[PDB]
Ligand binder design. Structure first.
Ligand SMILES: O=C(NO)c1ccc(CN(Cc2cccnc2)S(=O)(=O)c2cc(F)c(F)c(F)c2F)cc1
Ligand SMILES: [K+]
Ligand SMILES: [K+]
Ligand SMILES: [K+]
Ligand SMILES: [Zn+2]
Length: 355
């Protein structure tokens, strides 16, 4: 039983020309990689090569205009990179950004292919820039192309069009691009846990509330678990997994699980304000490994405390490799119970496991 790992230092080339201390740092991925070496997890994994996504693959989720504009940034002068970046919500661009975005997606395509051909049981993708804020038509929030959404469509393209893909997004932010891309789709179940604060937390949209359940044939296939008024941590994420994430996922019966694995809900993150521990992330991984015959791909999204994300993602890989889950600790916060109950009332009509 093999675990795959994809990492390519070329993804470090994407950088902020004017602010070498911008939190979406090149060393985010090299630090996670280094911690895998230190814990001697790297030699336990099979290395899956990176590759470039093709423009035809990008078109599975993105418009030709959006592809064309990001592609043109490779040849832009600094003044134009600044002006283009400023046209988006929270985006910086360098001449290498397009290439790195292509490498992040292609890395995940190769990992999903390795899983779906039975070459590996599961895999981890240490990639940047992130993806889940990227929309069909636009970049957003450090994301150029929606790597997890593209990977789900790539998976369907090499298997069957209706392959059931579950995307669990535990990044502290709502994946607005992933929700929108699949909102009318019953073949891709999107479940997000996120800090919400009644729409005030980035990305600042009420699209992230629990009452957005999907559209058309996708009604019931979009599950938003929004947190309000609390520094959430392990007890709250475990409760959400017990009452919502796992009963829904088991009923959906996915054939592949992608994790939009941002680590900005971790203790110590400068932006998320939450306190999920590396042991917490290990237990979330271990639970998801019970789905889809173990076919799980963990895709790095956000997370900006270099030490926290390195320890947190390494613990997820340890679980993928079959290691025993570590001990967990602290009472559950009642505001989390309020959120969980709101999602139960919104989704029990669609999911008999919640009744
Ligand atoms: O992908 C992400 N996470 O993983 C992610 C995506 C976007 C950002 C951008 N931020 C907003 C933010 C703030 C608080 C909590 N969350 C996110 S920002 O950096 O703070 C920022 C603040 C500004 F006031 C501003 F003008 C910016 F241009 C800007 F970028 C962060 C992370
Ligand atoms: K999320
Ligand atoms: K929406
Ligand atoms: K959906
Ligand atoms: Zn995030």
């Amino acid at each position: 039983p093999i675990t795959g790992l994809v990492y390519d230092q070329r993804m470090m080339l994407h950088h902020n020309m004017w602010d070498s201390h911008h939190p979406e740092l090149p060393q985010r991925i090299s630090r996670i990689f280094s911690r895998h070496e230190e814990l001697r997890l790297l030699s336990r994994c099979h290395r899956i090569p990176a590759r470039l996504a093709t423009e035809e693959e990008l078109a599975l989720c993105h418009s030709s205009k959006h592809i064309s504009i990001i592609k043109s940034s490779e040849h832009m002068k600094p003044r134009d990179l600044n002006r283009l970046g400023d046209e988006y919500n929270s985006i910086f661009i360098s001449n290498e950004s397009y290439t790195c975005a292509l490498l992040a997606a292609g890395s995940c395509f190769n990992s999903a292919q390795a899983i779906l051909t039975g070459q590996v049981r599961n895999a981890v993708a240490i990639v940047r820039p992130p993806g889940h804020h990227a929309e069909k038509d636009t970049a957003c929030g450090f994301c150029f192309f929606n790597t997890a959404a593209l990977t789900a469509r790539y998976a369907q393209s090499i298997t069957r069009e209706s392959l059931r893909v579950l995307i669990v997004d535990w990044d502290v932010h709502h994946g607005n691009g992933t929700q929108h891309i699949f909102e009318e789709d019953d073949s891709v179940l999107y479940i997000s846990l996120h800090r919400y604060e009644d729409g005030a937390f980035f990305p600042n949209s009420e699209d992230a509330n629990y009452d957005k359940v999907g559209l058309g044939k996708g009604r019931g296939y979009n599950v938003n678990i929004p947190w309000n008024g609390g520094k959430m941590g392990d007890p709250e994420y475990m409760a959400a997994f017990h009452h919502l994430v796992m009963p829904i996922a088991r009923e959906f019966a996915p054939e592949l699980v992608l994790v939009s694995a941002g680590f900005d809900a971790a203790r110590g993150d400068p932006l998320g304000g939450f306190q999920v521990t590396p042991e917490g992330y290990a237990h979330l991984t271990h639970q998801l490994m019970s789905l889809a015959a173990g076919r799980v791909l963990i895709i790095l999204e956000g997370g900006y405390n270099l030490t926290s994300i390195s320890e947190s993602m390494s613990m997820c890989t340890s679980m993928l490799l079959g290691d025993s889950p570590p001990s967990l600790d602290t009472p559950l916060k009642t505001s989390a119970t309020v959120s969980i109950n709101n999602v139960l009332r919104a989704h029990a009509p669609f999911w008999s496991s919640l009744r």
